[PDB]
């Protein structure tokens, strides 16, 4: 669980969530899987390395368009 996890400092937690929000499960847990080798520990080791990279690396237009289309809808909403 990225947000609840207190070992990660709060500034890093937000930055990790923004960059890797796609990897956060519906439960809120951050799920990462590679399985790039036939050895489980190497697969785990690859997972471990990514976390270290994620920790180190971590350490709106959409809203405007919705207003524009909503404004267009209101003007488009004229048959009274």
């Amino acid at each position: 669980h990225l947000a609840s996890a207190d070992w990660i400092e709060e500034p890093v937690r937000q930055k990790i969530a923004l960059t890797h929000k796609n990897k956060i499960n519906k439960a809120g847990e951050l799920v990462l899987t590679s399985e790039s080798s036939r050895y489980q520990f190497r697969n785990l080791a690859e997972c471990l390395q990514k976390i270290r990279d994620m920790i180190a690396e971590a350490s709106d237009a959409r809203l405007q368009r919705l207003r524009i289309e909503k404004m267009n809808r209101e003007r488009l909403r004229q048959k009274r």
Binding site: R38, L76, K79
Partner: protein, 287 residues
């Protein structure tokens, strides 16, 4: 000079696009991926308009203007029904509702959702109205039969659809006299399914027919009994039903949708989203 030269690029582009539309021996994208008296009276007015110096003065002064409202009413009367069919067909209502049967509408059906009492939200063809704005039954202005559908609002079966409210034996324009076969239900579009198209159908009634089969308990909050098919229902009544009016809007998910699913539908909110050495030397690259 012998070869013809289009004096604008777009003319070639439009001609090429028109050329591409027709099939050709050479490969193209599409193949792989695919009364009189009234007019004479009208013309007399046009000559008068041209003669008017004031209109000419505005044109040279580039200050002339036109009233949109006046044009809109005239357009509906003249060729509005034909454009009405295009929107319905483009959205796939005919294929989904009548299994491909196409009808030119003749009654200029118009619907709007009453916002309290001050104003009423229009329902255009292809309109966008939020489910929060559909908590109430809409006003319809145009015997007769009036029917409501959520074409893609069904949550379990693709072909099936649900009725919002169905009125039968509508006399002339007044709709309060129609039999309330189906009680009104607010829209309940599933989250993550985007825009659901709801079509409002008006059918000419040659003779009054009691649709006891289509009568539903009032109030009814069961989806199992709301499910129906337009095609078979229309086929059963195709003899006395000829569609002439249309009105349809698109709705997204909204906070009211949660209320509709829980308060009266009394079920969980539906959520969906489209999803886009020796022994080991042989296994590894090294060997």
């Amino acid at each position: 000079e012998r070869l013809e030269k289009y004096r604008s690029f777009e003319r070639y582009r439009r001609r090429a696009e028109q050329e591409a539309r027709a099939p050709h021996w050479w490969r193209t994208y599409r193949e792989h991926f695919v009364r009189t008296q009234k007019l004479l009276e009208r013309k007399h007015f046009l000559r008068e308009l041209r003669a008017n110096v004031e209109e000419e003065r505005a044109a040279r002064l580039r200050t002339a203007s036109i009233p949109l409202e006046a044009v809109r009413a005239e357009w509906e009367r003249t060729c509005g029904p034909y454009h009405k069919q295009r929107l319905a067909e483009y959205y796939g209502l005919y294929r989904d509702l009548f299994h491909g049967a196409t009808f030119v509408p003749w009654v200029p059906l118009h619907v709007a959702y009453a916002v309290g009492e001050e104003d009423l939200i229009p329902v255009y063809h292809g309109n966008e109205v939020t489910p929060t704005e559909a908590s109430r039954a809409p006003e319809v202005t145009y015997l007769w039969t009036l029917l409501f559908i959520n074409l893609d609002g069904h949550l379990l079966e693709p072909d099936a659809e649900y009725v919002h409210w169905l009125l039968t034996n509508i006399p002339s324009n007044r709709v309060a006299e129609g039999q309330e076969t189906c009680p009104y239900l607010p829209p309940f579009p599933a989250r993550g399914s985007g825009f659901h198209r709801f079509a409002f159908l008006l059918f000419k009634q040659d003779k009054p027919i009691n649709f006891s089969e289509d009568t539903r308990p009032s109030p009814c909050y069961q989806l199992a009994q709301r499910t129906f098919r337009t095609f078979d229902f229309y086929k059963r009544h195709q003899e006395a039903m000829t569609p002439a009016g249309l009105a349809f809007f698109q709705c997204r998910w909204d906070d009211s949708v949660t209320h509709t699913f829980h308060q009266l539908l009394d079920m969980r909110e539906p959520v969906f989203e489209f999803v886009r050495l020796r022994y080991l030397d042989r296994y590894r690259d090294s060997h």
